Amino acid sequence: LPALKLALEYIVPCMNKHGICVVDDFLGKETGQQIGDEVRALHDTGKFTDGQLVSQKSDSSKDIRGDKITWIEGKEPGCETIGLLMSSMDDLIRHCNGKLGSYKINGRTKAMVACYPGNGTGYVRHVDNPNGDGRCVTCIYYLNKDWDAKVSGGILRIFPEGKAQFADIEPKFDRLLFFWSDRRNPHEVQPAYATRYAITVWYFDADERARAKVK
Amino acid sequence: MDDDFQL
Ligand SMILES: O=C(O)CNC(=O)c1nc(Cl)c2ccccc2c1O
Ligand SMILES: [Fe+2]
Protein backbone atom coordinates (compact mmCIF):
# COMPACT_ATOMS: atom_id res chain seq x y z
CA LEU A 1 0.00 0.00 0.00
CA PRO A 2 1.10 3.59 -0.66
CA ALA A 3 2.47 5.08 2.59
CA LEU A 4 0.02 8.02 2.70
CA LYS A 5 -2.96 5.67 2.49
CA LEU A 6 -1.45 3.32 5.06
CA ALA A 7 -0.94 6.37 7.25
CA LEU A 8 -4.29 8.15 6.79
CA GLU A 9 -6.62 5.14 6.78
CA TYR A 10 -4.78 2.97 9.29
CA ILE A 11 -1.87 4.39 11.34
CA VAL A 12 -3.46 7.69 12.40
CA PRO A 13 -6.82 6.27 13.45
CA CYS A 14 -5.34 3.18 15.17
CA MET A 15 -2.79 5.29 17.12
CA ASN A 16 -5.24 7.96 18.30
CA LYS A 17 -7.62 5.17 19.19
CA HIS A 18 -5.51 2.44 20.80
CA GLY A 19 -2.03 3.93 21.03
CA ILE A 20 -0.67 0.79 19.32
CA CYS A 21 -0.67 -0.11 15.62
CA VAL A 22 0.56 -3.22 13.83
CA VAL A 23 1.37 -3.38 10.10
CA ASP A 24 2.16 -6.80 8.62
CA ASP A 25 4.06 -7.33 5.36
CA PHE A 26 5.40 -3.78 5.41
CA LEU A 27 8.13 -4.08 2.77
CA GLY A 28 7.62 -7.54 1.28
CA LYS A 29 9.85 -10.63 1.30
CA GLU A 30 12.67 -9.51 -1.02
CA THR A 31 13.26 -6.24 0.83
CA GLY A 32 12.50 -7.76 4.22
CA GLN A 33 14.91 -10.63 3.56
CA GLN A 34 17.71 -8.23 2.53
CA ILE A 35 17.29 -6.19 5.72
CA GLY A 36 17.59 -9.49 7.56
CA ASP A 37 20.86 -10.22 5.79
CA GLU A 38 22.37 -6.81 6.50
CA VAL A 39 21.34 -7.11 10.15
CA ARG A 40 22.78 -10.63 10.34
CA ALA A 41 25.99 -9.43 8.65
CA LEU A 42 26.45 -6.73 11.30
CA HIS A 43 26.02 -9.46 13.92
CA ASP A 44 28.43 -11.95 12.34
CA THR A 45 30.99 -9.18 11.82
CA GLY A 46 30.77 -8.10 15.47
CA LYS A 47 29.08 -4.70 15.14
CA PHE A 48 26.77 -5.53 18.03
CA THR A 49 27.57 -5.04 21.71
CA ASP A 50 28.00 -8.13 23.89
CA GLY A 51 24.57 -7.84 25.48
CA GLN A 52 22.88 -6.22 28.47
CA LEU A 53 24.31 -7.49 31.77
CA VAL A 54 21.44 -9.57 33.19
CA SER A 55 23.23 -11.52 35.92
CA GLN A 56 26.41 -9.86 37.13
CA LYS A 57 27.72 -12.05 39.88
CA SER A 58 30.98 -13.06 41.60
CA ASP A 59 32.52 -15.36 39.00
CA SER A 60 32.01 -13.32 35.82
CA SER A 61 32.95 -16.21 33.53
CA LYS A 62 29.26 -17.09 33.91
CA ASP A 63 27.82 -13.58 33.62
CA ILE A 64 24.58 -13.68 31.67
CA ARG A 65 24.08 -11.07 28.99
CA GLY A 66 20.89 -10.45 27.03
CA ASP A 67 19.88 -8.13 24.21
CA LYS A 68 22.76 -6.90 22.07
CA ILE A 69 22.49 -3.61 20.18
CA THR A 70 24.18 -1.31 17.67
CA TRP A 71 23.20 2.19 16.51
CA ILE A 72 22.73 2.55 12.75
CA GLU A 73 22.57 5.85 10.91
CA GLY A 74 21.49 4.21 7.65
CA LYS A 75 24.32 5.50 5.44
CA GLU A 76 26.83 2.88 6.62
CA PRO A 77 28.12 0.52 3.91
CA GLY A 78 26.24 -2.79 3.95
CA CYS A 79 23.29 -1.07 5.65
CA GLU A 80 21.62 0.43 2.57
CA THR A 81 18.38 -1.51 2.96
CA ILE A 82 18.29 -0.66 6.65
CA GLY A 83 18.68 2.94 5.53
CA LEU A 84 15.78 2.30 3.14
CA LEU A 85 13.62 1.02 6.01
CA MET A 86 14.35 4.17 8.00
CA SER A 87 13.31 6.34 5.04
CA SER A 88 10.15 4.29 4.70
CA MET A 89 9.32 4.76 8.38
CA ASP A 90 10.06 8.47 7.96
CA ASP A 91 7.64 8.82 5.02
CA LEU A 92 4.79 7.22 7.02
CA ILE A 93 5.41 9.46 10.02
CA ARG A 94 5.80 12.44 7.67
CA HIS A 95 2.38 11.68 6.14
CA CYS A 96 0.96 11.55 9.67
CA ASN A 97 1.89 15.20 10.18
CA GLY A 98 -0.38 16.84 12.74
CA LYS A 99 -2.64 13.82 13.09
CA LEU A 100 -0.87 11.69 15.71
CA GLY A 101 -2.33 13.35 18.79
CA SER A 102 -1.35 17.03 18.95
CA TYR A 103 2.29 16.15 18.38
CA LYS A 104 4.51 17.73 15.75
CA ILE A 105 7.32 15.33 14.90
CA ASN A 106 10.45 17.17 13.78
CA GLY A 107 12.97 14.36 14.06
CA ARG A 108 14.04 10.91 15.14
CA THR A 109 16.86 8.95 16.71
CA LYS A 110 19.24 6.75 14.78
CA ALA A 111 17.98 3.19 14.37
CA MET A 112 18.70 0.92 17.31
CA VAL A 113 19.16 -2.63 16.05
CA ALA A 114 18.61 -5.25 18.74
CA CYS A 115 19.42 -8.95 18.85
CA TYR A 116 18.07 -11.06 21.69
CA PRO A 117 20.59 -13.98 21.28
CA GLY A 118 18.10 -16.70 22.20
CA ASN A 119 19.57 -17.67 25.58
CA GLY A 120 16.32 -17.20 27.47
CA THR A 121 16.83 -13.51 28.13
CA GLY A 122 14.09 -10.94 27.61
CA TYR A 123 13.52 -7.37 28.66
CA VAL A 124 11.95 -6.24 31.91
CA ARG A 125 8.69 -4.31 31.92
CA HIS A 126 9.44 -0.66 31.16
CA VAL A 127 8.32 2.64 29.66
CA ASP A 128 10.52 3.78 26.75
CA ASN A 129 10.31 7.47 27.69
CA PRO A 130 9.06 7.87 31.30
CA ASN A 131 10.65 11.30 31.92
CA GLY A 132 9.69 13.42 28.90
CA ASP A 133 12.91 13.30 26.90
CA GLY A 134 10.98 14.13 23.73
CA ARG A 135 10.29 10.69 22.29
CA CYS A 136 6.57 10.43 21.58
CA VAL A 137 6.34 7.50 19.16
CA THR A 138 8.25 4.19 19.11
CA CYS A 139 8.60 2.35 15.81
CA ILE A 140 9.84 -1.23 15.61
CA TYR A 141 10.45 -3.37 12.55
CA TYR A 142 10.74 -7.14 13.07
CA LEU A 143 12.63 -9.53 10.78
CA ASN A 144 12.16 -13.05 12.14
CA LYS A 145 11.07 -15.67 9.60
CA ASP A 146 8.58 -18.30 10.69
CA TRP A 147 8.83 -17.12 14.26
CA ASP A 148 6.72 -19.32 16.51
CA ALA A 149 6.29 -17.75 19.95
CA LYS A 150 4.89 -21.01 21.30
CA VAL A 151 8.37 -22.55 21.16
CA SER A 152 10.74 -19.60 20.80
CA GLY A 153 9.01 -17.13 23.11
CA GLY A 154 10.06 -13.53 22.59
CA ILE A 155 6.56 -12.06 22.63
CA LEU A 156 6.35 -8.28 23.06
CA ARG A 157 3.75 -7.72 25.76
CA ILE A 158 2.27 -4.25 26.01
CA PHE A 159 0.09 -3.24 28.95
CA PRO A 160 -2.11 -0.35 27.71
CA GLU A 161 -2.78 1.99 30.66
CA GLY A 162 -6.55 2.46 30.56
CA LYS A 163 -6.93 -1.33 30.31
CA ALA A 164 -7.02 -4.53 32.37
CA GLN A 165 -5.76 -6.72 29.52
CA PHE A 166 -2.45 -6.62 27.66
CA ALA A 167 -1.52 -6.92 23.98
CA ASP A 168 0.77 -9.71 22.80
CA ILE A 169 2.70 -8.97 19.62
CA GLU A 170 4.93 -11.56 18.04
CA PRO A 171 8.21 -10.32 16.46
CA LYS A 172 7.12 -11.56 13.03
CA PHE A 173 9.08 -11.13 9.81
CA ASP A 174 8.26 -7.93 7.90
CA ARG A 175 6.04 -6.63 10.73
CA LEU A 176 6.07 -2.89 11.56
CA LEU A 177 4.84 -1.59 14.93
CA PHE A 178 3.89 1.81 16.38
CA PHE A 179 3.08 2.81 19.97
CA TRP A 180 3.14 5.91 22.19
CA SER A 181 6.56 5.96 23.91
CA ASP A 182 5.33 7.35 27.23
CA ARG A 183 3.57 5.99 30.33
CA ARG A 184 0.58 4.92 28.27
CA ASN A 185 2.47 1.84 27.06
CA PRO A 186 4.49 -0.03 29.67
CA HIS A 187 5.82 -3.11 27.90
CA GLU A 188 8.19 -6.03 28.15
CA VAL A 189 9.93 -8.58 25.94
CA GLN A 190 9.34 -12.13 27.08
CA PRO A 191 12.37 -14.49 27.27
CA ALA A 192 13.65 -15.48 23.80
CA TYR A 193 14.97 -18.96 23.04
CA ALA A 194 15.83 -18.19 19.45
CA THR A 195 17.86 -15.36 17.90
CA ARG A 196 15.42 -12.41 17.72
CA TYR A 197 16.06 -9.28 15.65
CA ALA A 198 14.22 -5.97 15.69
CA ILE A 199 15.02 -2.45 14.50
CA THR A 200 13.84 0.51 16.57
CA VAL A 201 13.47 4.20 15.75
CA TRP A 202 11.96 6.81 18.09
CA TYR A 203 10.27 9.91 16.73
CA PHE A 204 10.60 13.20 18.59
CA ASP A 205 7.85 15.67 19.35
CA ALA A 206 9.32 19.16 18.74
CA ASP A 207 7.95 20.77 21.92
CA GLU A 208 8.65 17.99 24.43
CA ARG A 209 12.18 17.74 22.99
CA ALA A 210 12.80 21.49 22.93
CA ARG A 211 12.17 21.83 26.68
CA ALA A 212 13.75 18.48 27.59
CA LYS A 213 16.83 20.11 29.12
CA VAL A 214 15.01 22.72 31.27
CA LYS A 215 11.80 21.12 32.56
CA MET B 1 21.04 13.39 25.09
CA ASP B 2 19.90 11.28 22.13
CA ASP B 3 21.15 12.50 18.78
CA ASP B 4 18.30 13.96 16.74
CA PHE B 5 17.93 13.60 12.97
CA GLN B 6 15.59 15.84 10.96
CA LEU B 7 13.86 13.03 9.02
O1 LIG C 1 11.84 -5.69 20.69
C2 LIG C 1 10.67 -5.61 21.13
O3 LIG C 1 9.69 -6.25 20.71
C4 LIG C 1 10.43 -4.64 22.29
N5 LIG C 1 11.68 -3.97 22.69
C6 LIG C 1 11.66 -3.01 23.61
O7 LIG C 1 10.65 -2.64 24.18
C8 LIG C 1 13.01 -2.35 23.96
N9 LIG C 1 12.97 -1.20 24.61
C10 LIG C 1 14.11 -0.53 24.98
CL11 LIG C 1 13.94 1.00 25.77
C12 LIG C 1 15.34 -1.08 24.69
C13 LIG C 1 16.53 -0.43 25.07
C14 LIG C 1 17.76 -1.01 24.77
C15 LIG C 1 17.82 -2.22 24.11
C16 LIG C 1 16.64 -2.87 23.72
C17 LIG C 1 15.41 -2.29 24.01
C18 LIG C 1 14.23 -2.94 23.63
O19 LIG C 1 14.29 -4.09 22.91
FE1 LIG D 1 10.88 -0.63 24.88
Please report residues of A whose CB lies closer than 8 A to that of B7: 90, 93-94, 105-108
The C-alpha of A127 sits at a distance from chain B's nearest C-alpha, in angstroms, of 16
Whole-number Å distance between alpha carbons of A133 and A113: 20
User: What CATH number is given to the structural domain containing A52?
Assistant: 2.60.120.620
Which 8-state DSSP code applies to residue A82?
H
Whole-number Å distance between alpha carbons of A13 and A197: 28
Closest C-alpha to A186, from A161, A208, A203: A161
Q: How many Å is the Cα radius of gyration of chain B? A: 6
Whole-number Å distance between alpha carbons of A105 and A124: 28
DSSP letter string, A15-46: HHHHSEEEESSSS-HHHHHHHHHHHHHHHHTT
In chain B, the N- to C-terminal Cα span, in Å, equals 18
B1 with A209: CB under 8 angstroms? no
Within chain A, where are the H helices? 3-6, 12-18, 29-44, 80-95, 149-152, 206-210
Burial class of residue A207 (count of CB atoms within 10 Å of its CB; 0-12, 13-18, 19+): middle
Resolution in A: 2.3
The C-alpha of B2 sits at a distance from chain A's nearest C-alpha, in angstroms, of 7
Burial class of residue A52 (count of CB atoms within 10 Å of its CB; 0-12, 13-18, 19+): middle
Count: domains in chain A? 1
Structural domain range at position A65: 1-215
Whole-number Å distance between alpha carbons of A154 and A26: 20
Pairing relationship of beta strands A64-65 and A196-205 according to DSSP bridges: unpaired
Phi then psi dihedrals of residue A88, to 5 deg: -70, -40
